[PDB]
Amino acid sequence: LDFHGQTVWVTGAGKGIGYATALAFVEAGANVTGFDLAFDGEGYPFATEMLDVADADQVRDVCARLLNDIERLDVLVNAAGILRMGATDQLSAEDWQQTFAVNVGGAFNLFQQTMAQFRRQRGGAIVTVASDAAHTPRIGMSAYGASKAALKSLALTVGLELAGSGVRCNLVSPGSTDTDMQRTLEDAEQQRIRGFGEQFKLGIPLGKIARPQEIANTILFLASSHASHITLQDIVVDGGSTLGA
Numbered sequence: 001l002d003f004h005g006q007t008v009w010v011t012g013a014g015k016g017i018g019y020a021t022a023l024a025f026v027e028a029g030a031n032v033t034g035f036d037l038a039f040d041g042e043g044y045p046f047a048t049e050m051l052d053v054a055d056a057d058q059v060r061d062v063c064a065r066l067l068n069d070i071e072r073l074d075v076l077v078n079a080a081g082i083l084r085m086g087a088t089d090q091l092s093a094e095d096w097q098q099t100f101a102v103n104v105g106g107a108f109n110l111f112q113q114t115m116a117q118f119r120r121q122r123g124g125a126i127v128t129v130a131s132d133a134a135h136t137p138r139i140g141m142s143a144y145g146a147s148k149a150a151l152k153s154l155a156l157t158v159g160l161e162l163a164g165s166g167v168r169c170n171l172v173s174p175g176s177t178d179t180d181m182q183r184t185l186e187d188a189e190q191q192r193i194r195g196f197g198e199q200f201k202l203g204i205p206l207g208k209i210a211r212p213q214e215i216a217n218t219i220l221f222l223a224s225s226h227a228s229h230i231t232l233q234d235i236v237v238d239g240g241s242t243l244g245a
C-alpha cells in the first residue's frame, strides 16, 4: 500500500494505536501529521501538533492554520480516545462527561473543521477507530461503549454526507489490543483470550490479543485505493471474539 505524496492526519498519535497508525503511514510513504494532548516520546517520525481534540476552539485554530498550507487532506484518522471504567451507577460525573467530550466530541470537532476541505477537494478517506464495545454490551464499560457507538453513528452519517464528494468513511473496531490503555487493567492476557463466561464475555477464537500494528494495517487498507469501493463499513479486528457482531 503506497501513500506517497499523500497528506495524512492522525489523532491520538502520541502513543498506542494512533502512534502505530501514523508510523505505518510514514512507512507507506505519506506526509504524516500526528495530533495528541501529549507527546511523551523523545522523538517522533512525523510532524506533531499539540491539540486537545475535545476543545472546539483549539481544534478550529489548529485546523485553520494547517489547512492554510495544504491543498489536500488525503486521509483523516480519528484514534484519540479515553477509557473510563465503572458500573453504570458508580461512574463519576467527570468520567461520564470526559468520556463523551473526547470520544465523540473530538471527532465531531475535527469533522466540523475539515468537512469543507473534503467537499472542496472532491475525494479523500476518513477512518475512525471505534471499539468492539460498540458492538456488544460490556460489563464495566457502559459509558465507554456508549461513546464509541455514538462515534460510529456520527462517522457513518458524516460518511453519508460526504459520499457525494467522493470521500470514503469507514471504521475499525478493535478488540483487546496490547497498548497502554489495555495494560492498566500478568495472567490478564491469557484470561482475556480464555474469556469470562460469568461476565458474558467471549474468549478470543484466534487465541491471542491484537497488536497495534494489526489495527494500523486495517486502517491503512481502508484508507487506501484498494478499498476504493468501500464506505460506511466497520471492520472489527478482534480475533473473532464478538463472533461477527
Ligand SMILES: NC(=O)c1ccc[n+]([C@@H]2O[C@H](COP(=O)([O-])OP(=O)(O)OC[C@H]3O[C@@H](n4cnc5c(N)ncnc54)[C@H](O)[C@@H]3O)[C@@H](O)[C@H]2O)c1
Pocket: 011, 012, 013, 014, 015, 016, 017, 018, 035, 036, 037, 038, 051, 052, 053, 054, 079, 080, 081, 082, 083, 102, 106, 129, 130, 131, 132, 173, 174, 175, 176, 177, 178, 179, 180, 181, 182
Ligand atoms: N487498546 C485497546 O484494547 C483498544 C480497544 C478498543 C478501542 N481502542 C481505541 O483505540 C484508540 C487508541 O487507544 P490506545 O489503546 O492506543 O490508547 P492510549 O492511551 O495508548 O493512547 C491514546 C492516545 O490518545 C490521546 N488522547 C486522549 N485524549 C485526547 C484528547 N482529548 N486530545 C488529544 N489526544 C488525546 C492520548 O493522549 C494518547 O496519546 C482509542 O480510541 C481507544 O479507545 C483501544
